[PDB]
Ligand binder design. Structure first.
Ligand SMILES: O=c1ccn([C@@H]2O[C@H](COP(=O)(O)OP(=O)(O)O)[C@@H](O)[C@H]2O)c(=O)[nH]1
Ligand SMILES: [Mn+2]
Lengths: 276, 277
């Protein structure tokens, strides 16, 4: 039960965004600026005392991206809510000392085909080991990125994927799905909804555990059949979200590369961008 | 429940092509507003079939209102959840006056024998415990003096839903007929409110509905002890409940219409469930 709140009335005959699609054929919202009242969403999620887990892999040279990642996350990611950062790394001492706000904590987790399966294997394994006990939602991203604007509770849902910024306006036959029938990730040209990027996905811990476990099993079958998918775990992620439809989809606002694509008018905010 | 779909053939959705240009299709709290053109029913049907879902439909037909049953059931057989398992529940004082109707495969009807204001909320709540929790997955609760004219399907199913009143979908919150006296449990001040929902069409999961109808009943009880009656009875208490507990779906006026009073505007691409004249 929410309390008395003061906010503008939503008008039935005034569309929120006229230049984009805001809901999927399976009735999952597509998150664009102007589709959500953040204050109503903040209060709904505060009233459940929501904790958000955020995972990143920072191994080898990739430890150098952490300072800017964590500093910008403190400015922009789930501000006002409880956050638990999880850092998979081989270099404990290289993790930068970062001042974290109230309700925010960090755990370090000290850990070619092994490399390719690592991400899906390690998220799924740690779901049983730690995540189911410690957080309500899991958010998995790349570390070579920086927050520049709001990324909050509007993304939270049982299961989500994010549109690849290079393909959001492309037709299905042009998507770089795995196209060989001998692979478990196979998607023919008369199938497919969107091309989801492997750099940003999430959901409830249970649904993330299911997705990541499933992708790992399919990868192992591929290895057994002597085949390797064209874009590795990203191919398997797309095959998964085809058959198990996400309950939200995030716009390319949430994954951008300004060097490659600039700042078109269709993006009102550039929230989470690649570091060159 | 996240189900696993088979290979399916259908047109690709387009990110840069708006869904409807004329209507709001998603609430400020990211709940879909269900208009025609927002959903692909092929995909949704398979999702819900893979769950083996049973839908319960409640109607109250007490005294004279029993005359409305024949038309309601015949049209429901043609339009309500066709292809899925349905369990009709008829609350009536006259079991024998229930018309003989032929039901399709996976469709059944039980009569709930009850005696002749706070009635509907309490009785729905009570029979959740007695029958509904074991027998169905979803509960859909409607007025009997109605007919089905077009498709009403799994697109409405969600943990909690309300339907926009046909008279108020284009009104400002000040014009909504909420209970306005602070003394009532149903009280809503002029600067509050998202929509005005009609008491003739609501539902959701059995657990969420059991909770809604339970809370509304005890809220009416408190009012009764203060010697007050809400302006629109159970509908007033329903609106108070849905302002503070946001629905996970909102059904458009397509799902509750009155053509005699309101005609047929352009923004309505279908009339699915309509009042009897
Ligand atoms: O004597 C009555 C009074 C009403 N009802 C039920 O209560 C609902 C609401 O009553 P009504 O339709 O008269 O209210 P309205 O929305 O038309 O103002 C009806 O649809 C019936 O299902 C009934 O069965 N018998
Ligand atoms: Mn009625």
């Amino acid at each position: 039960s929410l309390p008395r709140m003061v906010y503008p009335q939503p008008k039935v005959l005034t569309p929120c965004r006229k230049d984009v699609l805001v809901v999927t054929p399976w009735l999952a919202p597509i998150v664009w600026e102007g589709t959500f009242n953040i204050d109503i969403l903040n209060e709904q999620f505060r009233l459940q005392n929501t904790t958000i887990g955020l995972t990143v892999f920072a191994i080898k040279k990739y430890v150098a991206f952490l300072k800017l990642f964590l500093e910008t996350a403190e400015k922009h990611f789930m501000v006002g809510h409880r956050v638990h950062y999880y850092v998979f790394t081989d270099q404990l001492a290289a993790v930068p000392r970062v001042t974290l706000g109230t309700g925010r904590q960090l755990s370090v987790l000290e850990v070619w085909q092994d490399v390719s399966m690592r991400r899906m294997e390690m998220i799924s394994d740690f779901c049983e080991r730690r995540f189911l006990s410690e957080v309500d939602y899991l958010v998995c991203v790349d570390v070579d990125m920086e927050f520049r604007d709001h990324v909050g509770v509007e993304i939270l849902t049982p299961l989500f994927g994010t549109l690849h910024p290079s393909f959001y306006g492309s037709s299905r036959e042009a998507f770089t799905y795995e196209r060989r029938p001998q692979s478990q990730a196979y998607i023919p040209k008369d199938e497919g909804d969107f091309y989801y990027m492997g750099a940003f996905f999430g959901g409830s811990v249970q649904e993330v555990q299911r997705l990541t476990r499933a992708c790992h099993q399919a990868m192992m079958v591929d290895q057994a059949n002597g085949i390797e998918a064209v874009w590795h775990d990203e191919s398997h992620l797309n095959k998964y979200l085809l058959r198990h439809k996400p309950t939200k989809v995030l716009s390319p606002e949430y994954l951008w590369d300004q060097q490659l694509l600039g700042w078109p008018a269709v993006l009102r905010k550039l929230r989470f961008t690649a570091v060159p």
